[PDB]
């Protein structure tokens, strides 16, 4: 089953840890738990975002280009990638962006934070289509001590 995992801003804005204004920490506990143990896609923006592999997930990197790097798997397409991944119940897909797009029609899951903050960034989460999806969990959090922003976190399924 193929999931797409994400965090996103005022108007499906997305963008790199270090381009991140906020700082969640329950977010990242949160994306932690829920792909430990699974494979994780990603493109190489994103790989290069990141700089070591995570641990405790096979990482593979959908990308074009021949890969630089021993410690991860190396991917050229979308089937290629689902492939890698062999039989396993769930699949995870970081990003970035066009990783996003190419995978959420394959998507049947959908786990997003909400982050409440107005930010300027080049991109965009794919426009789902909410009519689409249901919403099978949430949860709203406060700013706090921790949490610079009120953030929320939400699971939906494809109806
Ligand atoms: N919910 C969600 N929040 C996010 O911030 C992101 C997503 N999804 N999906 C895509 C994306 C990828 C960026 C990204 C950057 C760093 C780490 C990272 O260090 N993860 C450690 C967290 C350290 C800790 O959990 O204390 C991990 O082991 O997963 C993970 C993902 C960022």
Redo the contacts with the bound molecule.
Sequence with gaps: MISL???LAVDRV?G??NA?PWN??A??????R???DKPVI?GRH?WE??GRP????KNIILSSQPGTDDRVTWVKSVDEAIAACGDVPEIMV???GRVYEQFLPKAQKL???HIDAEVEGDTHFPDYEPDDWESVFSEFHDADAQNSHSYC?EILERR
């Design positions: 995992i994400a965090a997305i790199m840890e991140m969640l920490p977010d990242l506990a949160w994306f932690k829920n792909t430990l990603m994103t975002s990141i995570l641990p405790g997930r970081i990003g970035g786990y997003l934070t976190f």
